[PDB]
Amino acid sequence: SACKDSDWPFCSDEDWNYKCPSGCRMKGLIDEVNQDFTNRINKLKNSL
Amino acid sequence: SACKDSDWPFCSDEDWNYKCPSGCRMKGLIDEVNQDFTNRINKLKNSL
Amino acid sequence: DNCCILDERFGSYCPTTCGIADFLSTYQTKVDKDLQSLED
Amino acid sequence: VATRDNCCILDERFGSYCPTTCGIADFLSTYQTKVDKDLQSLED
Amino acid sequence: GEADCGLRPLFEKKSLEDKTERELLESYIDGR
Amino acid sequence: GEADCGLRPLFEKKSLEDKTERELLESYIDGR
Amino acid sequence: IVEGSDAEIGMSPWQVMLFRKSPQELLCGASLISDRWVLTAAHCLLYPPWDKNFTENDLLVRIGKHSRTRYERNIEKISMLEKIYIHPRYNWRENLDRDIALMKLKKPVAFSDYIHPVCLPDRETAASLLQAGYKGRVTGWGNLKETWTANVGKGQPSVLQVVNLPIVERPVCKDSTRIRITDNMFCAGYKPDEGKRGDACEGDSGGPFVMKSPFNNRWYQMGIVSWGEGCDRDGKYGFYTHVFRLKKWIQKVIDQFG
Amino acid sequence: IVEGSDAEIGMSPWQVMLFRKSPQELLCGASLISDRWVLTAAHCLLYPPWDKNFTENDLLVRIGKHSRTRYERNIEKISMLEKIYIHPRYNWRENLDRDIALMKLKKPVAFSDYIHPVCLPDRETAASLLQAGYKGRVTGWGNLKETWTANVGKGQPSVLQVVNLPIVERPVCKDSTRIRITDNMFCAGYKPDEGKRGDACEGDSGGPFVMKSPFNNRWYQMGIVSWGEGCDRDGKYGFYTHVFRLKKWIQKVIDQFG
Amino acid sequence: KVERKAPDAGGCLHADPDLGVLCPTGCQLQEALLQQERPIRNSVDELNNNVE
Amino acid sequence: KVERKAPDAGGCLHADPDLGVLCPTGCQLQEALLQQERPIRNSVDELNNNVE
């Protein structure tokens, strides 16, 4: 075990494309986005 | 903040090449390796 | 699994977490656009 | 790299392509042992 | 490069003031 | 599958016994 | 295993290692008898007393392990499972009568040097080999001591442990046992006056009560470390299911979905 | 920036933001005046008193921000740097005399609708628009009160904050302080008998004491939030560096590298 | 329910400790995205129609 | 220093929380590898030669 989001420094504009997100995480967002997009879809279809 | 190596299951061999390493981690393992090799290389280049 | 192989030593090739996010960043936003726009 | 006949999925919309740490891991460990092998031996 | 500086694209270069662009002017000796 | 089962490639298939593969034999009433 | 020995490589190429996705824990031992089927202690999967109703999605088997812990890079094969089949007549309530459970592989397994299953006992060899005093080996990275009480020294093995012991006549079994014996159940140990401790222990279930066929020198597991009152005790002996007698069901299961 | 209003959009396309790589700290506002150069409080870089000796590879700047916090995708630009260029004649010992510093960029920045550098003072304009009572605008995400002691309300802002305050005659600035007054230094606030309190505060430093030129409606930062004896106290005024005068050094530096 | 925590989906810890947690592949993810795109735009354009 | 703590090299935190930490692309890595190969190969073959 260990914690405090390690000991990393910020990212520079350059960094993009030479350091990418955590596969795991991305999905999570990827998932999350859709859901809100669906329930909210459910919402429209249903409320109307 | 948060900790306990979160909440994940063990990967099945089927997983590999569908669930890969965490970039940052890799490099460290690479850097680790090579170094020992170096010093050990110098360790031999030197003994002679 | 491999099909995008581009150097057997390194096997199949995939996109980048980077290339993905942006695709989302583009993806997601345009979505909401039409949405919020219709929500009205 | 690729264009089409090399892969079966490719999508430009997701930008340029690169390996997978899986792919690398394998290249490390392998690559890595080969080294030692020679090392180890020479060491003697 | 200067001779193009101090020009807000969403103001001075596309004509307009900030919510209170009067103040500075109106602070010059006395109002405008 | 079977018809090839019950055999250790590191013993059976390549001829040889285990540290104490005899004891079982040796337990059959009496030794070999 | 109690009073055992750091077994050597390959003697157990059917020695499966049942594991829990989350948290990753080794729950039992299993038995390799085919690239898609594995035999083991039914209780290891389901035990309400100790509340247990595990399922494939919940656990997987680590095949061909030596070290009970450290991975075995390029060697140890880990496969998720497919459909878990347990014999309906398995009675945990009373005493684990028919304590034995089988499973199929979500995706087959390739037998190699370290990878390979045990042969299946036939009628002949059956009762043929089963006899008092006849020793038999088993295998499991299970325990080695009385877990929750006074116990020091060594607790959990580092690599599969060795264990060979004689088959015991029912009487002994029955008398020592306070549990409803079965023709399916059966003990085995070292009586008080011979001098060789050791016995199946906590977690060593699902293991293989191995026995080599004098006939064609092949190997036959005939009993699944079902249970035992305490770990290695004078007068106490682990009990192990009776493969063949309950082998019938076995075919029944594979014959259908194999 | 005390007593102010959640600023508009684009007001300051020069409003640079200095950030501390590791850890993530918003240290000071900066002054954008070119794709590869920026004005900033020297003090903001190194204040031995408060033990401060930050370097290029220690801090970075986020160009064109509105929110102190939330990223600003597509729009927000944060480039690395090249070499910081502090003023040797920078004396913090006594009183931040010449508290100010210029700096280069590892890589330029693309001035867009959101990005643009302020105009540098001209001799005329110089003494020209720098008269007491003269209201001027300046900005820095800087805090807003006296944080480390009893204080309710809120701590730091969310969106850049605006300040439009008049100039103050040297003597007033002089008697209102226990710190050596300079010809480059200069405060400015809102006397105890006018109404509008407010003034710069902790960390708002490195910002631009902006001033739009009448002659051509061109904007001009003619001061650098140097310091302030507390945060907006009637009779007490924030002081700002003196670009024009100091202006010399700066160019000489630019004239050799950029 | 009032601040915000990040979502880290599809992760499994690799049998090897040193390797630990395994995250989805670029492909793996790229694939999923377009998986939502097709049904997504559909229902999107599915709106407008009824809207006009 | 009795057990073993895995290595986590070259990375940075993304301006957006939701992205946070960003690691070496495969490409970065790959290339990073071979940049150490060549030197190694020499260092190695440069033994034998002096050994024989």
Ligand SMILES: *C[C@@](*)(O)[C@H](CCCNC(N)=[NH2+])NC(=O)[C@@H]1CCCN1C(=O)[C@H](N)Cc1ccccc1
């Ligand atoms: C599940 C196995 O791993 C574990 C191994 C140890 C048992 N025996 C020996 N000799 N070590 N088996 C058990 O714990 C079995 C099944 C669950 C209950 N159990 C027992 O041994 C009980 N302690 C006794 C018992 C009572 C009723 C029915 C069966 C066993």
Ligand SMILES: *C[C@@](*)(O)[C@H](CCCNC(N)=[NH2+])NC(=O)[C@@H]1CCCN1C(=O)[C@H](N)Cc1ccccc1
């Ligand atoms: C670096 C800036 O963030 C900070 C601005 C704070 C000003 N607050 C108000 N309300 N005007 N600058 C400073 O704090 C400067 C530099 C460090 C010292 N200093 C001060 O403001 C002191 N309070 C006074 C001072 C000390 C030494 C030299 C000059 C001024």
